[PDB]
């Protein structure tokens, strides 16, 4: 394999971390290939669930707990800390909150969260590499509680970063927030990508095309599919009671991605840096509720 940038995987991975039997498990947790029966039974479906009142309460709880866990990871972002160490803290924090770490064994993903440094667009596997001053790093958290998944991510700075890293991370966050601001009943899902790309393009940045936002509730990933680029062909119209993510991945150079031989790690083909932010949203009558918001601070971690 020819690597696209400086980053390399740092093996071996510590042995898989068990989840105590008392924590409720998603269907794929024990599947040998980590396949989700409940997901696959709906593969190829455009129909979007309308959440019930109990569904909404279940989503509010898990998305609040997921935010608490992301905040734990944020606290550890410093030079010299390995991504595996982050993952260990995240694993324990999910368990402490009576939650299963959703990524763990999801289609055989080996860890409890995704840590995506510099040119990694997404799905970086936590490993022995110590974080380096100047790095940017996304940690993507999903928890599973009482049958429901809650999903968020943020990009962080490791120590002091250069001007381009600041510009990329700020713009990616702006893209997400501008898209969130457009969410309300009657809006087509395909529209968010127009908003996101317009802002990214205006700042000299490209938009990843291979990975999308997603419906989430009793399923980790389900309808709607939500592209982040312009003139996409997404199917569906927002309605009150829809729950989905917007999770734009934005790049310094081109939009093209490829995957490492591990089958997971998605990287820029040019080896330039990529950043991502994510919230789980509930469409309401006035617009939408940001289920994964911070409750005690106005801003994401990279600002404060």
Ligand X SMILES: COc1ccc(N2CCN(c3nc(-c4ccccn4)nc4ccccc34)CC2)cc1
Q: Which residues bind K ion (CB under 5 A)?
A: 116, 120, 138, 274
Residue 257 lies near Co ion (rule: CB under 5 A): no
Quick note: the x/- pattern for Co ion over 145-164, rule CB under 5 A, is ------x-x-----------
Query: CA–CA distance from 261 to each of 9, 135, 244 (Å)?
Result: 10, 23, 30
Cα separation, 141 vs 132, whole angstroms:
21
106 binds, among ligand X, Co ion, K ion, none (CB under 5 to 8 A by kind): ligand X
Read off the DSSP letter of residue 42.
T
Please report how close the Cβ of residue 41 comes to K ion at its closest, in angstroms.
Answer: 33
Please report how close the Cβ of residue 297 comes to Co ion at its closest, in angstroms.
Answer: 20
Please report how close the Cβ of residue 154 comes to K ion at its closest, in angstroms.
Answer: 11
Q: After which residues, if any, is the chain broken (C to N > 2.5 Å)?
A: none
Alpha helices in the chain (DSSP H): 37-40, 53-75, 83-96, 163-181, 190-202
Please report how close the Cβ of residue 176 comes to ligand X at its closest, in angstroms.
Answer: 15
Please report how close the Cβ of residue 136 comes to K ion at its closest, in angstroms.
Answer: 6
Residue 199 labeled ligand binder: no
Closest to Co ion by CB, 82 or 245: 245
Q: Look at residues 251, 270, 249, 268 and name the one whose alpha carbon lies nearest to residue 260.
A: 268
Contact (CB, 8 A) for 302 and 155:
yes
Cα separation, 119 vs 73, whole angstroms:
20
Closest to ligand X by CB, 140 or 174: 140
Closest to K ion by CB, 29 or 120: 120
Residue 87 labeled ligand binder: no
Cα separation, 132 vs 8, whole angstroms:
13
Read off the DSSP letter of residue 239.
-
221 binds, among Co ion, ligand X, K ion, none (CB under 5 to 8 A by kind): ligand X
Cα separation, 31 vs 56, whole angstroms:
28
Closest to ligand X by CB, 59 or 165: 59
Cα separation, 98 vs 113, whole angstroms:
16
Residue 140 lies near Co ion (rule: CB under 5 A): yes
Please report how close the Cβ of residue 220 comes to ligand X at its closest, in angstroms.
Answer: 7
Cα separation, 210 vs 227, whole angstroms:
8
| Tokens of residue 148, six digits | 């429901």
Please report how close the Cβ of residue 87 comes to ligand X at its closest, in angstroms.
Answer: 12
By the criterion CB under 6 A, which residues form the site for ligand X?
Answer: 40, 43, 103, 106-107, 109, 114, 123, 211-212, 214, 221
Cα separation, 252 vs 122, whole angstroms:
15
Closest to ligand X by CB, 228 or 272: 228
Residue 91 labeled ligand binder: no
151 binds, among K ion, Co ion, ligand X, none (CB under 5 to 8 A by kind): Co ion
Closest to Co ion by CB, 126 or 160: 126
Quick note: the x/- pattern for Co ion over 226-245, rule CB under 5 A, is -------------------x
The contacts of residue 54 (CB under 8 Å, 6+ apart) are none
Contact (CB, 8 A) for 84 and 127:
yes
Q: Give the residue numbers of the binding site for Zn(2+).
A: 140, 151, 214, 247, 278
Binding region for a protein: 123, 221
Residues in contact with Co ion by the rule CB under 5 A: 140, 151, 153, 245, 247, 278
């Amino acid at each position: 394999y020819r690597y696209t940038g400086k980053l390399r995987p740092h093996y071996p991975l510590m042995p898989t971390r068990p989840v105590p039997s008392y924590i409720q498990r998603p269907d794929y947790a024990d599947h040998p290939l980590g396949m989700s029966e409940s997901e696959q039974a709906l593969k190829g479906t455009s129909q979007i669930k309308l959440l019930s009142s109990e569904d909404i309460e279940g989503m509010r709880l898990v998305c609040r707990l997921a935010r608490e866990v992301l905040d734990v990871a944020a606290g550890m972002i410093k030079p010299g800390v390995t991504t595996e160490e982050i993952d260990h803290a995240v694993h324990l924090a999910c368990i402490a909150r009576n939650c299963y770490p959703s990524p763990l064994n999801y289609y055989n993903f080996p860890k409890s969260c995704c840590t995506s440094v510099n040119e990694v667009i997404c799905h970086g596997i936590p490993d022995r590499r110590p974080l380096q001053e100047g790095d940017i790093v996304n940690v993507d958290i999903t928890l599973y509680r009482n049958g429901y998944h809650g999903d968020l991510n943020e990009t962080f700075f490791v120590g002091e970063v250069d001007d381009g890293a600041r510009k990329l991370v700020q713009t990616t966050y702006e893209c997400l927030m501008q898209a969130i601001d457009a969410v309300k009943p009657g809006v087509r899902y395909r529209e968010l990508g127009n908003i996101i790309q317009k802002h990214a393009q205006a700042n000299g940045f490209s938009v990843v095309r291979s990975y999308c936002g997603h419906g989430i509730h009793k399923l980790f990933h389900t309808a709607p599919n939500v592209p982040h680029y312009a003139k996409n062909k997404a199917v569906g119209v927002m309605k009150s009671g829809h729950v989905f993510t917007i999770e734009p991945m934005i790049c310094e150079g081109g939009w093209q991605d490829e995957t490492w031989p591990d089958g997971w790690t998605a990287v820029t083909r040019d080896g330039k840096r990529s950043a991502q932010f994510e919230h789980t949203l509930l469409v309401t009558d006035t617009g939408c509720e940001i289920l994964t918001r911070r409750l005690d601070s106005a801003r994401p971690h990279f600002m404060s």
